[PDB]
């Protein structure tokens, strides 16, 4: 791989470059780094095939969170298993197939069939369920050299993992860490405690484009908000008054909101998870760097 990427990618705010022809090669150095060789290509293919043309929750959004998984599994050697190290970063590479932009309220509100057939954290249950359909098929199994205890094993930290993505989740999953955090009952070894850390890591490699730097971050907010704002026009079609969130008429109000996303979601993120894995505190830094960013603006100074 090109000298500079080999080098940048080490760091937690790389940018994966607009060459889509080249991440699948970011993404099999990193898998590697931290497989059938055939068979991971043929598996990668599938994946991005099975992504959306949407502004957002597409195939470059599933490289730029594995990737943020890597640097963090990177910067903590010893803490994970190769398996989980695995799992994770598939997990990551998978978490948003087949999303068309909008979220699980809206599948609800439109009756979706997958709102019948999942009631809840909808679109990650059907994420998994195409992950598994993808490694069912044929030359598409990249762990065929695992037994099928650790095949079910890696399903299931891949299951939970995605599942975690669901941001309705995290708010539950991070008071309960903060709480084991500050009595000093957290144990990593305890096998629900760690769920609920890879939870979080899942949270913070998902977010994570509020931790480059800003001139990449700024970007990236207008491909979030053109799907909210899809979503809020779908919602007004159903007949349904949107939240402010994903009402276009209220994008002047867009540094607010993000103001309030930052102090209610990403800083206690990135927070809790540099207390328990101190170095992801760049995470963090990259984090309130861009809050302060976002203060300039309101201010009119940005
Ligand atoms: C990069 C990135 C990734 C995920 C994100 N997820 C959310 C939910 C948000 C987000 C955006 C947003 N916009 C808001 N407004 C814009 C104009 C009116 C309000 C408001 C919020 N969140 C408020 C925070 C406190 O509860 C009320 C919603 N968010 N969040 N930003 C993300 C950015
Ligand atoms: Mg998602
Ligand atoms: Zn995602």
């Known amino acids: 791989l090109p000298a500079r990427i080999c080098r940048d990618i080490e760091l937690f705010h790389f940018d994966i470059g607009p060459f889509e022809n080249m991440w699948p090669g970011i ?10 060789l055939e068979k991971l290509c043929r598996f990668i293919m ?6 959306r043309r949407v502004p957002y929750h597409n195939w470059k959004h599933a490289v730029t969170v594995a990737h943020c998984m890597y640097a963090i599994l990177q910067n903590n050697n010893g803490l994970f298993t190769d398996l989980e190290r695995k799992g994770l970063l598939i997990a990551c590479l998978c978490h948003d197939l087949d999303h068309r932009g909008f979220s699980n309220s809206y599948l609800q509100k439109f009756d979706h069939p997958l709102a019948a ?52 989740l995290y ?8 709480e084991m955090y500050q009595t000093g009952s957290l144990n990593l070894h305890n096998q629900s405690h760690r769920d609920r850390v890879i939870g979080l890591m899942m949270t913070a490699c998902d977010l994570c484009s509020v931790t480059k730097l800003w001139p990449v971050t700024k970007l990236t907010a207008n491909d979030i908000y053109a799907e909210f704002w899809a979503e809020g026009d779908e919602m007004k079609k159903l007949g349904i008054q ?61």
Not at 171 to 178: A, P, S, T, V, Y
Not at 273 to 280: A, G, H, M, N, R
Request: proline share 5%; hydrophobic share 35%; charged share 25%.
């Open 117 to 168: 057939l999942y009631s809840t954290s909808t679109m990650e249950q059907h994420h998994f369920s195409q992950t598994v359909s993808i490694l069912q098929l044929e030359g598409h199994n990249i762990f065929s050299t695992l037994s099928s205890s650790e095949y079910e094993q890696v399903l299931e930290i891949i299951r939970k993992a995605i599942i975690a993505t669901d941001l309705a």
């Open 27 to 36: 993404f099999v150095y990193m898998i590697h780094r931290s497989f059938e």
């Open 46 to 51: 599938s994946v991005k095939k099975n992504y």
């Open 242 to 302: 949107p939240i402010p969130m994903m009402d276009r008429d209220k994008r002047d109000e867009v540094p607010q909101g993000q103001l309030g996303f930052y102090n209610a979601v990403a800083i206690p993120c990135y927070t809790t998870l540099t207390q328990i894995l101190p170095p992801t505190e760049p995470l963090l830094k990259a984090c309130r760097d861009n809050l302060n960013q976002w203060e300039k603006v309101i201010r009119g100074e940005e």
């Open 171 to 178: 708010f539950g999953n991070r008071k309960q860490l903060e």
